Design a binder for this molecule. Structure first.
Ligand code: GDP
Ligand code: ALF
Ligand code: MG
Length: 305
């Protein structure tokens, strides 16, 4: 079996791969985690530094004037760093800005790491499976991973999903059993990182429409993962799906919006009466899910194949 993990930038592709090693292989060894210790430490800082650079751009102020020394020592250091980062994370000014995160770029896992700060900052800190799932590394190029399942030799190819990487795709097309197209549900109200005047989700719909109907997959199963449902569930509550879809006349319910974004995506499907779209909703950082949905994923291919 040959699967292709296609999607836009930060849609969750790489986080779905990590989940394959956890459901089908023994989930990350204590040293295999320690290897991501530096990346965690790195995501955390970049996360906090992003907020502080954001406040000054949006002209937001702190809550206490003691954030000068903290945010200043934070840039100089670039172990008191922990406390320094801690104090910052609390401050009303910081938090107030963290909400308007949509207006700029912030690591999805930012809240995660900074909330588990004390644990993460302990000398003998050995990152957990989840900590490794949460990490952020821009994928550049093509990463291959082979593994077995219900007897099939799976060869999963995970590529970078960005305007600059989307060209390296054509060579991993011919032999391809099925592909998983990951969509970040929470991208409805954000804009591209390569173009500021491009709704992150419309970009995904352009890509999906392109892949979904590309002739090289007339017989390749198309799986749609509407990833980041957990972040989507927290964002419609304070943001209108109208920002992405002006025609959207339904309610601001995680359930209705989600059943619009879905329909939106599947309607782009040509080869319509001769091809089905297997849509799911996922939370890539939740092993329970990724395997429950993947369990169905393998099953559908077993039917179709
Ligand atoms: N909260 C949450 N974060 C996610 C989810 N899927 C991925 N992420 C995080 O989003 C970031 C980007 O995902 P990644 O898989 O590296 O991107 P891709 O490889 O470009 O598709 C990583 O830091 C992930 O931990 C999800 O369903 N929920
Ligand atoms: F943004 Al990517 F893999 F598509 F890190
Ligand atoms: Mg990647």
């Amino acid at each position: 079996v040959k699967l292709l993990l296609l999607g836009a930038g930060e849609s969750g592709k790489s986080t779905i791969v990590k989940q394959m090693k956890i459901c089908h292989e023994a989930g990350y060894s204590e040293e295999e985690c320690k290897q991501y210790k530096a990346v965690v430490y790195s995501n955390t800082i970049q996360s906090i530094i992003a907020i502080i650079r954001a406040m000054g751009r949006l002209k937001i102020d702190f809550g206490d004037a003691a954030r000068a020394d903290d945010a200043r020592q934070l840039f100089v250091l670039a172990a008191e760093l922990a406390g320094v980062i801690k104090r910052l994370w609390k401050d009303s000014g910081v938090q107030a800005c963290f909400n308007r995160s949509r207006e700029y770029q912030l690591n999805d896992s930012a809240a995660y790491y900074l909330n588990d700060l004390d644990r993460i900052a302990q000398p003998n800190y050995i990152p957990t499976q989840q900590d490794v799932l949460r990490t952020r590394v821009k994928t550049t190029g093509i990463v291959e991973t082979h593994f077995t399942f219900k007897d099939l030799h799976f060869k999963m190819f995970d590529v970078g999903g960005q305007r600059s990487e989307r060209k390296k795709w054509i060579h991993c097309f011919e032999g391809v059993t099925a592909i998983i197209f990951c969509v970040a549900l929470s991208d409805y109200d954000l804009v591209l990182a390569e173009d500021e005047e491009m709704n992150r989700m419309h970009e995904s719909m352009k890509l999906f429409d392109s892949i979904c109907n590309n002739k090289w997959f007339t017989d390749t199963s198309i799986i749609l993962f509407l990833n980041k449902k957990d972040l989507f569930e927290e964002k419609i509550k304070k943001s209108p799906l109208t920002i992405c879809y002006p025609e959207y006349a339904g309610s601001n319910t995680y359930e209705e919006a989600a059943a619009y974004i879905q329909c939106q995506f599947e309607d782009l499907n040509k080869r319509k009466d001769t091809k089905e779209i297997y849509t799911h909703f996922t939370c890539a950082t939740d092993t329970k899910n990724v395997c429950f949905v993947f369990d169905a994923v393998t099953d559908v291919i077993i039917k179709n194949n």
